[PDB]
């Protein structure tokens, strides 16, 4: 009735000790040729041995972990204690308690017969003292709209405070519940005006009598529509662009403008900035977008800003949707052959490779609608260029390759192309 029963903490903070204990009933550790030990198993991976103590007070530890592990043994109480010291979050997994027995007195090599059950051990990933300050919908705001800053943290903070740069007194103070250790607060800005722009920064604390944490990353809020001058957005290529040709959006203004912001209407990374260089009769600054792809699609708005007050803006320019489409291409049929010699093989393979086609449906049938004896048309591989390719192979009796004439027809409907190729082996 030899059984092992292990128990201990099942959730330990990072860089802290673990104190699993094993209580064994059914055998006495004072008898010769016995031993208890601990064996780990990460979820899914293979087992790994950690510690072992024999009847005589001899301890073995896995050499990669000899510094951290430590096993202590008590005979009368029938208990063994494992005390792994530093617990990084890659040590999670089931921990078994085993009953090792020696083979012979020649070498301290053992086989684990009676295993335990195992206690799941989980290690906290780690906390971030810095709060995160994010704004919805976006850093660009209308002159009359109610913003909502989201100062959030995952360090169990009970209350947050919001500071605007350049002011000595805190703007607002809020609180939140440590819901499973994650906290979030939503400061509401009322009707915005010219003076609400700036660099908002939020802190955190455990309670009003504690010390405040490190400042969050500064967030910029820009007010739009303060100036009088209007800006216009003009794209040098056509509004519709085939993929590859490098778009160059251009911003023009009739006034003395310094910096031009260009924002993508959808949720994007961040607005761009550039300095305005005087041109023929207008201040302008062009953004080279480089080789466009399907990602740079959407609505683009070009603002205007001046460094007299760097957080102000002009009115948004007229939206300019940028549409990208992959042009259809005609398949090219190349003929692939077994090779010059396929001697002594009863059935040989002949085939057509259709290379570079973009609308996806292509259809290959050998010798019109006949030769349906084995035509297999393989599925198509989407090449990184963005053009698909597909192949088909017809198994044929060998002597026939000399006389029977096998040829293949491709039908790519969207590009209105029908190509036939007469494949042969020579």
């Amino acid at each position: 009735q030899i059984t092992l029963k292990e128990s201990g903490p099942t959730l330990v903070e990072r860089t802290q000790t673990l104190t699993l204990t094993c209580t064994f009933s059914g055998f006495s550790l004072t008898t010769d040729g016995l031993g208890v030990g601990w064996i780990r198993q990460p979820p899914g991976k293979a087992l790994e041995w950690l510690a072992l103590i024999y009847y005589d007070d001899v301890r073995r530890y896995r050499p990669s972990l000899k510094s951290r592990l430590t096993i202590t043994k008590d005979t009368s109480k029938n208990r063994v204690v494992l005390t792994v010291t530093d617990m990084d979050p890659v040590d999670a997994g089931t921990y078994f308690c085993v009953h090792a027995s020696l083979f012979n007195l020649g070498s301290r090599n053992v086989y684990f017969r009676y295993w335990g059950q195992g206690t799941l051990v989980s290690v906290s990933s780690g906390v971030s003292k810095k709060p995160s300050l994010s704004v919805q919908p976006g850093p660009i705001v209308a002159p009359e709209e109610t913003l909502t800053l989201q100062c959030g943290s995952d360090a169990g903070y009970n209350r947050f405070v919001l500071y605007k740069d350049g002011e000595r007194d805190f703007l607002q103070l809020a609180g939140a519940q440590p819901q499973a250790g994650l906290s979030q607060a939503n400061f509401t800005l009322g009707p915005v005006s010219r003076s609400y722009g700036g660099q908002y920064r939020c802190y955190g604390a455990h309670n009003l009598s504690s010390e405040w944490s490190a400042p969050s990353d500064p967030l910029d809020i820009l007010i739009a529509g303060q100036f009088y001058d209007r800006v216009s957005l003009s794209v040098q290529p056509g509004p519709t662009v085939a993929s590859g040709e490098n778009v160059t959006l251009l911003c023009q203004s009739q006034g003395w403008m310094q910096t031009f912001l260009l924002t993508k209407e959808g949720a994007a990374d961040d607005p761009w900035r550039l300095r305005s260089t005087y041109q023929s009769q207008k201040y302008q600054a062009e953004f080279p977008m480089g080789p466009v792809t399907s990602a740079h699609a959407g609505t683009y708005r070009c603002y205007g800003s001046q460094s007299s007050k760097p957080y102000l803006l002009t009115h948004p320019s007229d939206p300019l949707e940028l549409v990208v489409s992959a042009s259809t291409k005609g398949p090219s049929v190349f003929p692939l052959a077994p090779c010059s010699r396929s001697t002594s093989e009863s059935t040989a393979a002949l085939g057509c490779l259709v290379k570079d086609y973009f609308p996806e449906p292509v259809t290959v049938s050998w010798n019109s609608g006949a030769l349906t004896s084995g035509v297999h048309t393989f599925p198509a591989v989407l090449q990184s260029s963005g053009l698909y390719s597909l192949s088909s192979v017809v198994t044929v009796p060998s002597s026939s390759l000399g006389t029977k004439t096998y040829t293949c027809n491709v039908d790519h409907k969207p590009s209105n192309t029908k190509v036939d190729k007469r494949v042969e082996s020579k």
């Binding site: 064996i39 293979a46 087992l47 790994e48 041995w49 072992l52 073995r60 530890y61 896995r62 050499p63 078994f96 083979f103 020649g106 070498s107 301290r108 090599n109 053992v110 086989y111 684990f112 017969r113 295993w115 335990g116 059950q117 195992g118 090219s332 190349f334 003929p335 692939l336 052959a337 077994p338 090779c339 010059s340 010699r341 393979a349 085939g351 490779l353 290379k355 297999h376 393989f378 599925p379 198509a380 591989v381 090449q383 990184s384 390719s389 192949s391 192979v393």
Partner: protein, 214 residues
């Protein structure tokens, strides 16, 4: 000797013996034992020496030794033998113990079928268009897990290989293809190119030589 290597996975249809090997340098002068860990359970010892077996374990599991590797033979695999099988030994001197990586015996449905790979060299018409592609076609294999490896004169090539995922056929046997993109200068330099396919356990190779059969 710090590593005891095992196959990553072994699959076998019912009624056929499955062989699991545990190779390591330290197995020459130390004993070994074999463990079975069914999912969501505790590992159960099977055989505790090179050859001898516990009383309760059925007659199917029998072990053998040969040189620096020990092997298990699950004679007559049944549906209740799907688990992970581990291996144990010690260091060379007799010391800190070791555990193998551990296989995973899995019972199949339809019988295993080996791939049939056909390799096609670029046509003479390829080179006029300043292009050259090698096409490797794999069909009629089961289950759907392949890994193609393109080698030029043995040395691995990973510049231009494009592989599709396995797809179902009408026969419930998967099929997949692989294409290599080559400039005409490269194809006229190396001696031979090979498309190696590795099934669950296999290595089927096909070779094409630009200078020989073109």
């Amino acid at each position: 000797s710090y590593d005891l290597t095992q196959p990553p996975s072994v699959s076998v249809s019912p009624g056929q013996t499955a062989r699991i090997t545990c190779s390591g340098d330290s197995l020459a002068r130390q004993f070994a034992s074999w463990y079975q860990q069914k999912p969501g359970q505790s590992p159960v010892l099977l055989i505790y020496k090179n050859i001898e077996r516990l009383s309760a374990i059925p007659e199917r599991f029998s072990g053998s030794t040969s040189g620096t590797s020990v092997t298990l033979t699950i004679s007559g695999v049944q549906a209740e033998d799907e688990a992970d099988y581990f291996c144990q030994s010690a260091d060379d001197s007799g010391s800190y113990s070791l555990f193998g990586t551990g296989t995973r015996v899995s019972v199949l449905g339809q019988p295993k079928a080996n791939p049939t790979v056909t390799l096609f060299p670029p046509s003479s018409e390829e080179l006029q268009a300043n292009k050259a592609t090698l096409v490797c076609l794999i069909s009629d294999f089961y289950p759907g897990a392949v890994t193609v490896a393109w080698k030029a004169d043995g040395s691995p090539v990973k510049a231009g290989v494009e592989t599709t995922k396995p797809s179902k056929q009408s026969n419930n046997k998967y099929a997949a293809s692989s294409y290599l993109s080559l400039t005409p200068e490269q194809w006229k330099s190396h001696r031979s190119y090979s498309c190696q396919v590795t099934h669950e356990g296999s290595t089927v190779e096909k070779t094409v030589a630009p200078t020989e059969c073109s």
